[PDB]
């Protein structure tokens, strides 16, 4: 009943969201930082390949590895495909205003085809056509 | 400033395969090669920023 983070969660549970955003931000982020540091520390001491490990170590690693997974912004990370295939201050973009809002004038007058949320939409030879898992699963089987 | 600069110039004049085998046999090198440290800093910064931004984005979509 004296740990800095063990009272933070309790006081958040009791008081609730009656305070401003920053206090809730810090109170939630403390435990996240602690968890990431612990998991990274355990992972460092390990080996890489799974053919050189015992049973208990393999189970521990496979259980605790998954907390580093990310799902939403993979494409932005991976776009850096351009090097494998070949061999911007918002204003130059079309369909986006300076305040990161949609520009209706161009999209309604000039008949803009698509909106370049990210780079690589200018010109483009990397394709990357959207798919559906179930169609592929039926196709294979 | 440091007295190990001469080590830096002679280290720099090596074909990458030479450095690879020198590390592999374990005889010499690893703390004085001016590329690994840059790799660590750049990749650490990328990892931290991307993790934070992904967390906030998924929370907003929640």
């Amino acid at each position: 009943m004296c740990e800095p983070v063990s009272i933070g969660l309790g006081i958040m549970s009791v008081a609730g969201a009656t305070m401003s955003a920053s206090q809730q931000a810090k109170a939630e982020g403390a435990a996240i930082d602690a968890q990431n540091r612990q998991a990274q520390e355990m992972i460092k001491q390990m080996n890489y390949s799974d053919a050189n490990l015992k049973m208990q170590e393999r189970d521990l690693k496979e259980q605790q590895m998954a907390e580093l997974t990310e799902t939403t912004l993979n494409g932005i990370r991976n776009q850096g495909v351009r090097a494998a295939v070949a061999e911007d201050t918002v204003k130059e973009r079309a369909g986006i205003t300076e305040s990161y809002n949609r520009d209706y004038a161009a999209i309604f007058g000039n008949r803009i085809a698509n909106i370049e949320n990210t780079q690589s939409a200018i010109r483009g030879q990397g394709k990357i056509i959207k798919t559906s898992p179930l169609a592929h699963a039926l196709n294979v089987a | 400033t440091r007295a190990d600069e001469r080590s830096n110039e002679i280290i720099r004049k090596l074909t990458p395969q030479q450095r690879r085998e020198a590390i592999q046999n374990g005889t010499l090198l690893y703390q004085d090669d001016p590329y690994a440290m840059e790799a660590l800093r750049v990749k650490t910064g990328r990892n931290a920023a991307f993790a934070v931004d992904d967390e906030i984005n998924v929370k907003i979509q929640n």
Partner: peptide, 17 residues
């Protein structure tokens, strides 16, 4: 609720008159 998030798109297609 919130079954699964929606991945961010590269670029999006629209239409006009």
């Amino acid at each position: 609720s919130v079954q699964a998030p929606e991945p961010a798109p590269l670029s999006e297609e629209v239409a006009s008159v």
